[PDB]
Symmetry: C3
Subunit: 112 residues, 3 copies
């Protein structure tokens, strides 16, 4: 009964605390919480980044120098609660998947 | 059943995390959590600030230059769990309701 | 109700990763290792008592306190590493006197 009220308060406090996160350091984690992704969803985003980063390294080893298709695949599978640009810049700023993010930022720069 | 224990743990963790908040940037959010205010209570505080800020803007437009009574109204309706001085300084430091807070801080300097 | 709690547990896991480790490594440690409130409090109580024992022995003229670290390692929650906990407590500014004595002892024996 009141266990629900305890949980609501905790939910309110997380909403307050995420507002105190240094956005220059952990914007991606702030994004996950702010957009309400579950653990499964958050992990699914990372797996997409893992696989596309691994595909990028593989293609580079094979002599590929353009990887525009990787961004389209990313955009096509990324959780719809998230914005592509916003997620990429957040991952980038938090220091995650650097190689892949720099490639995505480069591609967006060419087409935006 | 055992859902109580997992919640108790989360409550402990929020208590630890609020202690890690940069008090020069988010003292007001820290105060809400530290004093145990519910979401409804936190929002009620913001609503008082909204209305007194709007009353202040309205009185300034009408030519008033003193607004001492706004602090008495604030102090009389502010949630009992909070200290007037502490709340005002917290709101001020976090950058919220600047106009109203500066007026409140001025009034307090004249009467404290 | 279970799913809401699970999400909060995930968010706490995310938030603890945003903690400034130069300022609150000990609190980050408690959360990261999953200690309950009672466990967290029990750690502080061990530090309280050994800090008090240290102040007491200093007053009596003792100048070596190696045994205090052994007592600490012997009672400290098994979920925590001794070195890691001491450095986290030290860096967060807690039990300064006791931690400096522990760090000194470790330097002599590590
Ligand atoms: Na799709
Ligand atoms: Na009243
Ligand atoms: Na033991
Ligand atoms: Zn893989
Ligand atoms: Zn209004
Ligand atoms: Zn004692």
């Amino acid at each position: 009964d009141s266990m629900d009220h305890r949980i609501e308060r905790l939910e309110y406090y997380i909403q307050l605390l995420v507002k105190t996160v240094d956005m220059d350091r952990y914007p991606f984690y702030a994004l996950l919480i702010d957009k309400g992704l579950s653990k499964e969803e958050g992990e699914a985003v990372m797996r997409i980044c893992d696989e596309l980063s691994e595909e990028l390294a593989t293609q580079k080893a094979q002599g590929f120098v353009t990887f525009d298709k990787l961004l389209a695949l990313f955009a096509g599978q990324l959780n719809e609660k998230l914005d592509v640009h916003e997620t990429i810049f957040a991952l980038y700023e938090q220091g995650l998947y650097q190689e892949l993010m720099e490639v995505f930022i480069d591609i967006m720069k060419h087409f935006d």
